[PDB]
């Protein structure tokens, strides 16, 4: 809702907001997000439009295989996309999406080449686990297991 992306501005859904800020509220929110996601999936099935699924630009998107074996220009673009890749204009970006774990963002630095110069991956689980000391202090040992579960921690995301 704060920064719509990829047709999320053309479907209707609601967000559940807690009041007490504890694990039970977060469980209820994740169950509402279950039903809201099912609500979105139904709309996507009905509203799926025709057309290409990738950008109509063969300098970035690979051409179709049938067109590759008949067209001279398609073969060249197919050859270069898989051997050298496509160059990205120099610059930097910070793109964030509403990941199921929270806010997942990538800080990608481009130098005008075909390889990213820097790719910082922002993990919501990495930030959630950093607050574990502030949140789990004073609770008992079985409460820590619940707090770990309520943060939805996947340690590949944390240790990317």
């Amino acid at each position: 809702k704060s920064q719509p992306y990829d047709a999320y501005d053309k479907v209707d859904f609601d967000i559940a907001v807690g009041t007490k800020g504890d694990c039970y509220d977060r469980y209820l929110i994740r169950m509402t997000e279950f039903r809201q996601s099912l609500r979105i999936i139904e709309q996507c099935c009905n509203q799926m439009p025709p057309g290409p699924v990738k950008v109509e630009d063969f300098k970035v998107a690979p051409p179709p295989r049938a067109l590759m074996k008949e067209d001279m220009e398609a073969l060249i673009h197919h050859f270069l996309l898989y051997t050298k890749g496509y160059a990205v204009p120099a610059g930097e970006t910070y793109t964030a999406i509403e990941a199921p774990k929270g806010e997942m963002a990538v800080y990608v630095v481009s130098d005008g080449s075909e390889r990213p110069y820097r790719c910082k991956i922002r993990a919501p689980g990495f930030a959630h686990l950093g607050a574990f000391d502030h949140i789990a202090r004073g609770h008992f040992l079985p409460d820590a297991v619940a707090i770990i579960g309520t943060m939805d921690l996947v340690f590949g995301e944390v240790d990317r």
């Binding site: 074996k69 008949e70 073969l75």
Partner: protein, 124 residues
């Protein structure tokens, strides 16, 4: 004789034996590349000491199979068009000139094309 088993040749001077495990392929004795390691030398390793050589992967030599295909002769045209005989599941379509008095193979499939006017010259 271990000279036909370790040297690259255009043709095998004898008939390949399908049951012989020292051949490069079941249908070909000699290797078909100058940098291709002979199978007999490769199998003479410590890792084959207690291993049955019959069950090892021994695919047929493609060089002997491709030359069993008859030459395609084109009538009233000096250009041959080949795309793998499969279309979308073949290879990129290429055009082969047939002006020269010989069969010219495809750059991908290896199928050889020639004009019918040169059929007598090629076969002899």
């Amino acid at each position: 004789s271990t000279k036909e088993l370790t040297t690259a040749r255009i043709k095998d001077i004898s008939k390949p034996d399908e049951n012989n495990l020292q051949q490069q392929a079941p249908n070909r004795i000699s290797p078909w590349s100058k940098s291709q390691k002979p199978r007999a030398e490769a199998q003479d390793n410590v890792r084959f000491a207690v291993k049955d050589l019959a069950k090892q992967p021994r695919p047929y030599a493609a060089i002997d199979l491709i030359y069993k295909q008859p030459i395609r002769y084109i009538e009233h045209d000096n250009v041959a068009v080949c795309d793998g005989n499969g279309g979308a599941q073949g290879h990129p379509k290429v055009y082969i000139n047939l002006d020269q008095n010989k069969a010219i193979p495809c750059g991908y499939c290896g199928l050889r094309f020639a004009q019918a006017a040169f059929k007598e010259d090629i076969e002899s």
